[PDB]
Amino acid sequence: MVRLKKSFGQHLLVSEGVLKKIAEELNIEEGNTVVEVGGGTGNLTKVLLQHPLKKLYVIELDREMVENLKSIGDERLEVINEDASKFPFCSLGKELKVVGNLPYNVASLIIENTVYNKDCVPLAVFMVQKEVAEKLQGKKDTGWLSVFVRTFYDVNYVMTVPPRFFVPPPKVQSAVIKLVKNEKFPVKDLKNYKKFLTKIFQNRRKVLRKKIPEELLKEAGINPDARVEQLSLEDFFKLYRLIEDS
RNA sequence: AACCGUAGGGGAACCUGCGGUU
RNA sequence: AACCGUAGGGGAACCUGCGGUU
Ligand SMILES: Nc1ncnc2c1ncn2[C@@H]1O[C@H](CSCC[C@H](N)C(=O)O)[C@@H](O)[C@H]1O
Ligand SMILES: [K+]
Known part of the structure; x- marks a missing residue:
């Protein structure tokens, strides 16, 4: 029609x-x-x-x-x-x-x-x-x-x-x-994985130590004073495991 | 110019936090 | 789950500065 x-x-x-x-x-x-x-x-x-x-x-x-x-x-x-x-x-x-x-x-x-x-x-x-x-x-x-x-x-x-x-x-x-x-990597319940990423891209201009503890980021070897639009895919895996409850 | 990139203005999808009635 | 409130995020149409190019 x-x-x-x-x-x-x-x-x-x-x-x-x-x-x-x-x-x-x-x-x-x-x-x-x-x-x-x-x-x-x-x-x-x-x-x-x-x-x-x-x-x-x-x-x-x-x-x-x-x-x-x-x-x-x-x-x-x-x-x-x-x-x-x-x-x-x-x-x-x-x-x-x-x-x-x-x-x-x-x-x-x-x-x-x-x-x-x-x-x-x-x-x-x-x-x-x-x-x-x-x-x-x-x-x-x-x-x-x-x-x-x-x-x-x-x-x-x-x-x-x-x-x-x-x-x-x-x-x-x-x-x-x-x-x-x-x-790539085994993520279960994409439900809480989505909710994780959608909190990281919140205020994407700000530093990361402002949404995830500074030392906890220094754990994964991730610069605490870095933006969201710099992380590799591995980083998103790397920090999601040990910060978000699954 | 259009187009692509970039920097604002503009606000339409969509998203999260907390709280209220359940 | 749902509806409302609220704080932000996000930034499409459309407008402009700049840089290429018709
Ligand atoms: N939520 C939804 N689920 C499935 N289809 C949808 C939809 N919302 C809109 N559509 C339909 O998806 C189509 C997208 S336009 C694509 C039309 C097709 N390529 C053609 O040329 O014939 C529309 O016809 C629209 O009616
Ligand atoms: K805003």
Whole structure:
């Protein structure tokens, strides 16, 4: 349908080149189950099925856009109508290739959710807002979510997508990012690990001895008078174990 | 210019601490 | 858990100084 409820952040990607570049990056092989957050009118959906899928899952929230199991008449296509920011991905298999052009308003929530379902997603490819994409990369800017993702996934940037390659053109830039899973370190209950990092990135300009005891930081060999945006990934592991109750 | 980087202004997602009624 | 309060964090759209480049 038209009217495209902008409250849902639905901007249809109308560009052949990037649509199939998003699909190719998943490395879809013979018997893979792919999950697509926010299918929409199904521009990416039509491209994913062009690959040798086993099963395409589409998690769409819009009860009018989900009705578009239309011309896309495929036996291996199933459309689930629920919120992908809260949906349990691991209720669809043990190894799932997640993909999706994310709506800006909830994009960060779906990413956080897939990291919760890490055990059943070997790799994910997302189209996100630039200020979210460049943040998750790590090098120029970070956040609590950036480290939360990178702890389990090796984030590798793919491409920038100009606002013109969309129908209702967003005022922000977009980017495709690939989330390849790499076994860094064993963090249990991501619930309290998230709450840990989100307290460290609180007042990120201030020194660290101001949020974690000065000598307790001198323990892990971490400069007490250092900012949050200087710590290696190991540091985040290194100090989380012995400061936060798990 | 747009674009990228950078420095403010601006405040929309989202987050935490404490507290209150439960 | 939930709703409210409260202190901060965070900083998108949009605006500008500066530096590259059409
Ligand atoms: N919470 C949520 N969970 C799942 N899907 C959502 C969602 N919130 C919004 N969406 C849907 O996700 C889509 C993102 S726009 C992506 C559309 C698609 N790439 C295309 O071009 O056809 C929108 O269609 C929107 O309706
Ligand atoms: K503030």
